Structures are given as C-alpha cells and as structure tokens.
C-alpha cells in the first residue's frame, strides 16, 4: 500500500493557513523520490533527516499539514521563526523533525478579480504554541477602547484575506505548503520506504 501523498500534494483545494489541514499517514510504504526528483518545489527542507535518506527510514506517527500562504512568508514555516504566520497561524517547534515543501500556486490560487478566499489570522493576544490551531473569531481589542464583543474603532475582526491577483509580484503570490511531521523512535513503525 503506497502512502497517499498525491492526495495531500495534489488536492484540488487547500486550507487557509489559520485553519490549516492535517492528515495522518499510517500503515503504508512511502516513495519520497517522486518529491525530490521533481523541480516543481521552491522550498524542500528537512529537519533531523536528510531528504535523500528518507526512503531508508521507518517512521512513527507521520502527519501531513497543508495550507496556502504568501510566497514571502514561506521562511516562517521553519523551526525558530517569527512573524505573522509563525506567531498567529502555524507554528513549528524548535525541535521539529520532518520536511517543509512549498511551491508557487499562482496558476491555481490567483484570480483576475483577486482571490480573497484564503485567510490568515492578523491579530492575537499571544503567540501560538507549536502545532496549535486557532479558528476563533472573537473581536480583537487593538487599542485603549473596550470592544464588548462589538466591531468598531480599534476593535477588529481578527482574520484578514490575502489578496491574490495574477499580476502580483512573486513574493505576493500564493504558495501551497505541505509540512510532513516524523517521529524516529525505538518503537514500531507503520510508515517505511521502498
């Protein structure tokens, strides 16, 4: 049984980063060569393992997280990063073990009028913990004036839309991101290579 990476990587729709998607990979064999043999990825970084040594390993509790962000935010999807995405949307632990894969998705995620369907969290009282997911939509008190759960001056709805237009600069174009989480333990492993 081949692991269903195609349905993660080639899913027609991707989640907004604030509501990032996660799928468990279990009881299957994985050929990662199909990933690194292509030149479709603008980011392909592995932590705690080398990408060309992935097929030689067995893993426990494999996870594949996926979402869309802006091109110039992809560096935040790494251990030890900060910024709007790493702080408020999707946070990797300093001790992350896995791979971060990204590619430009302007052709699929941009639109002549502007695609505003992809959202990110703009405001938050504190930084996310690693792998924490926050889908709340309470009004954010950005200033001295109380909000009482009402939108108004200095009282903001916390999610904002990316504006993806096809003629944006590359750094402002949408990128699809897949984060593969691994654990390499002295324990049984249901995910192995060829």
């Amino acid at each position, epitope marked *: 049984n081949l692991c269903p990476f195609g349905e993660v990587f080639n899913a027609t729709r991707f989640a907004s980063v604030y509501a990032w998607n996660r799928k468990r990979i279990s009881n299957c064999v994985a050929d990662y060569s199909v990933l*690194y043999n292509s030149a479709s990825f*603008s980011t392909f970084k592995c932590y705690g393992v080398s990408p060309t040594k992935l097929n030689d390993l067995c893993f426990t509790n494999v996870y594949a997280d996926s979402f869309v962000i802006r091109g110039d935010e992809v560096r935040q999807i790494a251990p030890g990063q900060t910024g709007k995405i790493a702080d408020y949307n999707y946070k990797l632990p300093d001790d992350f073990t896995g791979c971060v894969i990204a590619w430009n998705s302007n052709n699929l995620d941009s639109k002549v009028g502007g695609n505003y369907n992809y959202l990110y969290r703009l405001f938050r009282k504190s930084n996310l913990k690693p792998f924490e997911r926050d889908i709340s939509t309470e009004i954010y008190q950005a200033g001295s004036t109380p909000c009482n759960g009402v939108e108004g001056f200095n009282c903001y709805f916390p999610l904002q839309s990316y504006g993806f237009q096809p003629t944006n600069g590359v750094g402002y174009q949408p990128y699809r991101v897949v984060v593969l989480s691994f654990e390499l333990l002295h324990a049984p492993a249901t995910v192995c290579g060829p």
Partner: antibody, heavy 122, light 108 residues
Framework: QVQLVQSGAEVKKPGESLRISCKGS????????ISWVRQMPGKGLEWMGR????????NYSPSFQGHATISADKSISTAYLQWGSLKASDTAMYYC???????????????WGQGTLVTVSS | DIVMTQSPSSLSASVGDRVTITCQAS??????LNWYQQKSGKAPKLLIY???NLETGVPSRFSGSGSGTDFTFTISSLQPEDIATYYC?????????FGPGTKVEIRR
C-alpha cells in the same frame, strides 16, 4: 550590479585547515542560494553543494561525503567553503555562484565569483 | 543519481558555421536543463536556462531545445569569441548535476 568576490589563491600543506570565502554585493544576500563548484585540473565542473544564507540550510552533492563544509555569515554577506584537513586531491579551482531566489524553483547560476585556485602541496 | 552526457567531446568549425551539440540525461528531467559557456581562464557563464530560454544580454545566435532525456544547444553562426567549453546542467529541488562539457574550437 550583482557581484560575487572570492578570496585570493591559496597554497597549503596536506593536513592543514583552510577556509575560502565568497562575498555577495548588489542584491539581498539572504534571499538567494549560493553554490560551490569545483574544477579539478583539466576536468569539468562539479557541483559540490549550496547554502541558503537566511538559515544556513545546506544541500550537499551526493559525491562530497563530509570532506569540505559549506557555511555562511549573514552579517557580512559572505559564504564559505572549508576543510578541516586538506588532501592532495583538494588541489582545484573553486567557484561560488548565485543560484535561485528562495521563491523560485528554477535553478540556474546567473552570477559567479572569479574563482579561487587552491594548491595542496608540501 | 542522474548521469549527464554530452556529445561530441570536442569539435572544430569555421566562423559562420552552425554548431549543434547534444546533452543526454539518464532519466526524464522535463526541461530542467541549463547551458553554460566557460572560456579559458574565466568563470562559466549562463547562456540558456530551462532548456530554451535565452539569458538576458546573451547573443541571439545561441539557442537550446529539447526536453525529457535529450537536449540540444546550437550556435547558429559560430563567432571567433565562441571558443570555450559548453556544459549542460540538470537541476531539481535539491541540487544540480553538470554534464561533462563539449570543447568548441575554430577552424580558419
């Protein structure tokens, strides 16, 4: 103008350590991969590896096991190639090259350093 | 583990001749191939990227074509300053592999 400037020619005895450098100017150093390329006496070009200066992420060629190590110093727009203990077979010309922008998946070397000639000899 | 080959290993042509050299990859690499020129005593110079795109400022007598496992690089009208070794270069999401080079000399 994008420029890559390498350190001067070097002669070392076998077993000595050596670090050669490559300083980028005229562009955002932390946004492009820097590669190192070896040219043996009379031979062709061999890609050794590449480093992302923003996080010092390194991809090494499968050939180069762990002899030469690539590094970068963000603060001074400089990338490095270094040997803990040189061997005769390290006698070569070494080029650094700017590769792809981190946003770009199309690899190509659009700018090159002038090359550093290394001689390992007693 | 991608092996790149080039043919011929060397050639001689007259000024104004059309020169075509080839590059082969051991597996399908789509159009993920570049071409470089290296003059004696110089760093290599990118001429063609992604199999067929002319680098900015590169004379238009140079061109490249092909995809998959076979590629071609063509000088439509060989000029005296064109004496050099020409390299193809495969790439993927991790790194690069250079071809072995084709040395071009001029007949006069």
């Amino acid at each position: 103008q994008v420029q890559l400037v390498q350190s001067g020619a070097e002669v070392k005895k076998p077993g000595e350590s050596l670090r050669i450098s490559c300083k980028g100017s005229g562009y955002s150093f932390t946004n492009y991969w820097i590669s190192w390329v070896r040219q043996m006496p009379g031979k062709g070009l061999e890609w050794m590896g590449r480093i992302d200066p923003s996080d010092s992420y390194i991809n090494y060629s499968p050939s180069f096991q762990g002899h030469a190590t690539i590094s970068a110093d963000k603060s001074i727009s400089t990338a490095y190639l270094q040997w803990g203990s040189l061997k005769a077979s390290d006698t070569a010309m070494y080029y650094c090259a700017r590769g792809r922008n981190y946003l770009d998946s199309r690899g190509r070397f659009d700018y090159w350093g002038q090359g550093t000639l290394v001689t390992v000899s007693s | 583990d991608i092996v790149m080959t080039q043919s011929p290993s060397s050639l001689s042509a007259s000024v104004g001749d059309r020169v075509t050299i080839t590059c082969q990859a051991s597996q399908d690499i789509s159009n993920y191939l570049n071409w470089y020129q290296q003059k004696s005593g110089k760093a290599p110079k990118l001429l063609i990227y992604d199999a067929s795109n002319l680098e900015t400022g590169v004379p238009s007598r140079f061109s490249g074509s092909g995809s998959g496992t076979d590629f071609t690089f063509t000088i439509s009208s060989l000029q005296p300053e064109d004496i050099a070794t020409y390299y193809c270069q495969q790439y993927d999401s991790l790194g690069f592999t250079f071809g072995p080079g084709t040395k071009v000399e001029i007949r006069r």
